């Protein structure tokens, strides 16, 4: 009564319009009485210099603290009283501010976002308050070994480049960044041509466009001649960073090879490969019967508490690899099996496992785009990265093209005899020497 292939075609196309100032407006209409609307910006620590690294994160902390039109908690009270939710997030390349609200409140939602993105107060006393909150959050992040090891992995794999920088910035910058630094950062990156107004839910594109024309037209579409921030390529460096701390109970290790970058077609076959190796943690019910050899071995031999493969993408590079948490006596075994599995895929992926990978990736894609928020973000981010919304029907075609041969060739291209970036934190005396890890890549 409807094949999986037909459900793909039934997905409403994403509508894309553009304002005179360069701002893109995109939406996916559904029948939901709620929606998510927000602004995605091509701004992130990758655009920051050693000097103002942390600026973007600082702004995120002030973004909802009051605007010129709605000073102090006024903005907050408006969002709350209509039962909406206002959230934000900053990564190394993108920033986003978005609202979840009743579809009927779309007008007030679009207004509030416009207000936030253009009339943010950045009061001096609030900047001093946030300075302390951020310093506290830095201390909290220090207790998250996962956060720490991923920041280290970036710091070493992209050493000497803007991608080596963390999103939050060094504590000394949090202490010295000034309103001037922030206003400078904002005026330079928050430009209409670098923003996408996205929305998903029970709303029509024309209405969103209407609201966009009304509230974002004044948004600047220019910034000097030497203002236009441009990303330079970020060199990847095979290397290792080890923060030995025997006082911690478990070791965290993250290892990655340089990935292709967002726009590259290879990402699909790489996601299929990562889906084959998969993820795992001590609470999974499959145990010894898990399809992934790594998960299976890990479970029966109790080699780790958890592990996850990942494909972190940036403009023209990325981190393709895995992260695992284990006992100090299991690091070597984990690394051995993990690398063994990468080599197995490069040289012998079988059709049956690649078919399992494809199916997992199909299920991941669809189950992920469930709800207005995930869809809205996919719209915002896709426009910024691909420059278009890639339809599920297209994703299916790209996945369908992947077979054992493609997995072997694509995995060989990125893993086989390539230098990895390695980050370790905790009781890591048993983390293999870099030469051994490197030899394990072939």
């Amino acid at each position: 009564t409807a094949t999986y292939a037909q459900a793909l075609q039934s997905v409403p196309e994403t509508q894309v319009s553009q304002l005179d100032n360069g701002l893109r407006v995109a939406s996916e209409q559904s029948s939901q009485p709620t929606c998510t609307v927000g602004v995605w910006i091509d701004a992130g620590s990758r655009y920051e210099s050693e000097k103002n690294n942390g600026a973007g994160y600082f702004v995120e902390h002030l973004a909802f603290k009051g605007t010129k039109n709605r000073p102090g908690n006024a903005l907050e009270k408006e969002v709350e009283s209509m039962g909406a939710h206002l959230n934000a997030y900053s990564t190394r390349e993108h920033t986003a501010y978005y609202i979840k609200a009743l579809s009927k409140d779309l007008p007030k939602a679009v207004e509030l976002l416009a207000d936030i993105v253009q009339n943010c107060s950045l009061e001096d006393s609030q900047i001093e308050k946030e300075r302390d909150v951020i310093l506290q959050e830095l201390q909290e992040n220090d207790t998250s070994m996962r956060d720490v090891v991923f920041n280290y992995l970036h710091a070493t794999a992209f050493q000497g480049t803007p991608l080596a920088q963390s999103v939050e910035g060094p504590s000394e910058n949090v202490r010295k960044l000034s309103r001037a630094d922030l206003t400078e950062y904002l005026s330079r990156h928050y430009k209409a041509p670098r923003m996408v107004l996205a929305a998903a839910g029970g709303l029509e594109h024309r209405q969103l466009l209407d609201l966009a024309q009304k509230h974002f037209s004044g948004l600047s579409g220019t910034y000097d001649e030497d203002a236009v921030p441009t990303l330079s390529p970020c060199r990847f460096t095979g290397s290792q960073i080890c923060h030995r701390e025997d006082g911690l109970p478990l070791a965290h290790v993250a290892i990655a090879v340089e990935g292709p970058g967002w726009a590259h077609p290879d990402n699909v076959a790489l996601q299929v490969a990562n889906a084959i190796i998969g993820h795992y943690d001590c609470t999974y019910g499959g145990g010894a019967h898990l399809s992934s050899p790594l998960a299976s071995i890990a479970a029966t031999n109790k080699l780790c508490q958890s592990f996850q493969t990942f494909n972190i993408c940036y403009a023209d590079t990325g981190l393709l690899g895995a992260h695992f948490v284990c006992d100090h006596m299991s690091i070597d075994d984990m690394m051995f099996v993990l690398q063994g599995q990468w080599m197995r895929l490069c040289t012998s992926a079988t059709e049956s496992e690649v078919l399992r990978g494809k199916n997992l990736l199909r299920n991941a894609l669809v189950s992920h785009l469930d709800g207005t928020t995930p869809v809205c973000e996919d719209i915002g981010r896709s426009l910024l990265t691909y420059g278009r919304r890639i339809p599920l029907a297209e994703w299916e075609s790209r996945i369908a093209e992947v077979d054992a041969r493609v997995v072997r060739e694509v995995c060989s291209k990125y893993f086989y005899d390539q230098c990895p970036a390695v980050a370790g934190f905790g009781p890591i005396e048993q983390l293999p020497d870099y030469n051994r890890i490197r030899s394990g890549m072939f």
Partner: protein
């Protein structure tokens, strides 16, 4: 399944901002999975 849980299990707060949302407002739910990390809500 294919999607990994937001937080992987293994066996924070230093400011109010990071504390907001921690207070429980609803009854507990416990989930176990074959392919995904366990979770506890509320």
């Amino acid at each position: 399944a294919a999607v990994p849980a937001t937080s992987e299990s293994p066996v924070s707060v230093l400011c109010r901002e990071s504390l907001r949302g921690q207070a429980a407002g609803r009854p507990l739910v416990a989930s176990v999975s074959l392919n995904v990390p366990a979770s506890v809500r509320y």
